[PDB]
């Protein structure tokens, strides 16, 4: 079931067992369950172009070419049913290596207890 798959994904990403990722699973379920406004772009080519522009903006032309090649390979493989959604997700999760990661203050650890 997709829910079990999401739980397993959370466990894999966190490196904890599914029982240890219950709060993260709940957070994910809450986020997915929230009503979202329609996505700006539901067109695979528009999402791909936005991802390419974002990759070029970070001066990662090699990474932009690699992304374009991976998108071409995914499109030819035909395994994904919603190419536009996956491309939009990948664009949304890209991070600029030049923008120094806003190091999550050690202070966040204070409230975890």
């Amino acid at each position: 079931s997709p829910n079990v798959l999401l739980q397993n994904l959370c466990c894999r990403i966190l490196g904890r067992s599914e029982a240890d990722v219950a709060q993260q699973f709940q957070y994910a379920v809450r986020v997915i369950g929230s009503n979202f406004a329609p996505t700006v772009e539901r067109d695979e080519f528009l999402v791909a172009e936005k991802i390419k522009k974002e990759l070029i903006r970070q001066r990662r032309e090699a990474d932009a070419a690699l992304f374009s090649e991976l998108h071409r390979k995914l499109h030819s493989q035909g395994v994904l049913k919603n190419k536009w959604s996956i491309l939009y997700l990948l664009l949304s999760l890209s991070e600029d290596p030049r923008r120094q990661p806003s190091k999550v203050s050690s202070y966040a650890t204070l409230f975890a207890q």
Binding site: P2, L5, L6, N8, L9, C10, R12, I13, L14, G15, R16, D20, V21, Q23, Q24, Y27, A28, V31, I32, S34, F36, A37, T39, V47, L55, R60, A62, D63, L66, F67, E69, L70, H71, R72, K73, L74, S76, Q77, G78, V79, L80, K81, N82, W84, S85, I86, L87, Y88, L89, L90, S92, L93, S94, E95, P97, V104, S106, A108, T109, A112
Partner: protein, 66 residues
Amino acid sequence: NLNAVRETMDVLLEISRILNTGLDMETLSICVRLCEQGINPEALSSVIKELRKATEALKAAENMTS
């Protein structure tokens, strides 16, 4: 079909590595399967961000307890 899925997953992993996304092969396959089932990409991005924050908190806790 299996070879096509493997090629797509390898391409996705290479793209994630070049873009420094931090996704592994299993996580990328799970995301691809979820996307094929119709999940909204904005909701998926928000969920991914929350999961990444939780994973970072868990990694910080594991590094503090070790």
